[PDB]
Amino acid sequence: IVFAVLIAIYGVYLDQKIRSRIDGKVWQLPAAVYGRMVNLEPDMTISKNEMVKLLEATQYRQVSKMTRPGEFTVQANSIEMIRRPFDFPDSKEGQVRARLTFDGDHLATIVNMENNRQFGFFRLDPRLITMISSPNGEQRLFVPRSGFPDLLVDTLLATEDRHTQQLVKNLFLSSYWRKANEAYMALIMDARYSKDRILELYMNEVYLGQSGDNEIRGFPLASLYYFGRPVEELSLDQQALLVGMVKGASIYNPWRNPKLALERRNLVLRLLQQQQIIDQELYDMLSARPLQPRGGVISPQPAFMQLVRQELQAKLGDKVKDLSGVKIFTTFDSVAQDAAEKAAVEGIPALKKQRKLSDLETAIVVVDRFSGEVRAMVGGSEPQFAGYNRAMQARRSIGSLAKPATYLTALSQPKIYRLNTWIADAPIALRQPNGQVWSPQNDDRRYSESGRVMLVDALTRSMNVPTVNLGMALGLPAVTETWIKLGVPKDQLHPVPAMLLGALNLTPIEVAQAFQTIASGGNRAPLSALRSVIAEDGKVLYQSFPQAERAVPAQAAYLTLWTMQQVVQRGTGRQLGAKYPNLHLAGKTGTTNNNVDTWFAGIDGSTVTITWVGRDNNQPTKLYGASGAMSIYQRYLANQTPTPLNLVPPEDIADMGVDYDGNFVCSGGMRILPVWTSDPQSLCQQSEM
């Protein structure tokens, strides 16, 4: 009877091996990357239709009636939704049935339907974008017993045990003799663990699919992969297939073989319809429902994830992937990204067919006007398969998009340079070392009859000759100092006269930072993709704080933005001002010699949007001016709902009237211009002639 001692002592070693993994770190859970968290408040400038696209972009479903969470219904002037549960960083939250009611172009109320009482603010769960690739290649999403519906548990138990045996198989075993080992270790833990815990570990471990060279396993990550919704919100027809795929994940895959995978769902629906849980009253409904996502996803948002990945080890260090169950909260906006991706996908072939181009590429970057939080990033014409990210990697000449920096430097000197100061416009010839004389020309190759133009109009019209006359009067290091204050790389600045008209090679995310500093009213906000990084135990690892650094005077930035509103209404960008006049959009056009690169920096009330349009091989685009990059921005403005830019003038701003000769008038005048003054009595000094 010595065999009874060998098996008894062996069981203690199996019990020690189970206790070590289960009581502690079970799996190396990858880091979940979520999008932005949108709070909703009374009198918020959001429409009903704008809220519908926000909800659908955050994985909500428009339905006739609401049953499970992540669902909503539209009415004449209101939306009724069930806000899904989400463990937010500030406070954990359950399901919330609420009605968002609209007056016109604003959210009037948000009322909880269970108590018929308003909310001061209402949180919206962030969209799960992707999971950060693990070394082992076992991608999962942990969900405790509480998160799984009881019908999904009944559908599982009905087709497997019907009171665990395959849990121990996938835990520590591999691929007849060790079936006794599987039977012994199953009964050891089943007796020494809870009835609820065995379903939790099983539902997160089971293999349900593949996504390239990484194993997608567990009901939670599989639900979002196969259906685009969490495990909690699975319809019984979707639960039947997800339960059915446990036996043959690869053979019952809907992408490789849809016909074979369709029969499994109906077979599992019969196993439960034959038993008590379901009857034949609804078999015809669930058997008709076909399976939704089209061809899964290997790498969602590759462009935006480059910035997230770069920023993670640059802030927290590479000592972070070792941690399990990390929660990364990004600034990503799904409405803007979806709007930008369509504008790039549809806008590129629209230009190639009209102008007869063989190839044309693009890059769009949207950031917050005041905080610099990166809201969207498109780095190519077709973001279906995107290896190269033009928004970060493609470093190109900014061209005429460099002109605002010269006028900013000038307008920061209120006592000498203003919006009515005259700049010369006659032939120029600047000698330089090595070697020929530099004779810059306007696009027109024309000069003004009077031999001068006032500052305001030179920027409005993007006049080359007066920008060189202004830029050289201030000095090249004064203009270069503004580029450093605007937040561009110092290694890219070469202070020579060519720099004044665009000899400066920046990438769209570096241009985004420059225009952001202006957009805020001269406050440089270091561009960021991360909001916070939280551990599995709720402890914060990284948390953003405001970094608004006073770069240039607020009055100088205001007048430069006021002039950029004239650029879009009557100047180089007059095309967009006629389409969207009610936004009062501020912006600037970008063109290089032979139009190798085209750009547009568009600022609205809420964001800064930089757009580049050029070829990868640095060749002439055969496109008129900045119309190439403006038409992509027009499509982005069309694809989502922009915010009107209603500029609030800072202190010491006085709207003064000037005569035809460009001098301030006491009473009246024929052209009103904002001017940086504490005492607007400059008119006395001008009128006493």
């Binding site: 049953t67 499970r68 379901i278 609804l282």
Partner: peptide
């Protein structure tokens, strides 16, 4: 029982 099947009709409709 009929209390399980009736709830499922209004949940899936």
């Amino acid at each position: 029982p009929e209390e399980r099947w009736r709830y499922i009709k209004e949940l899936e409709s």
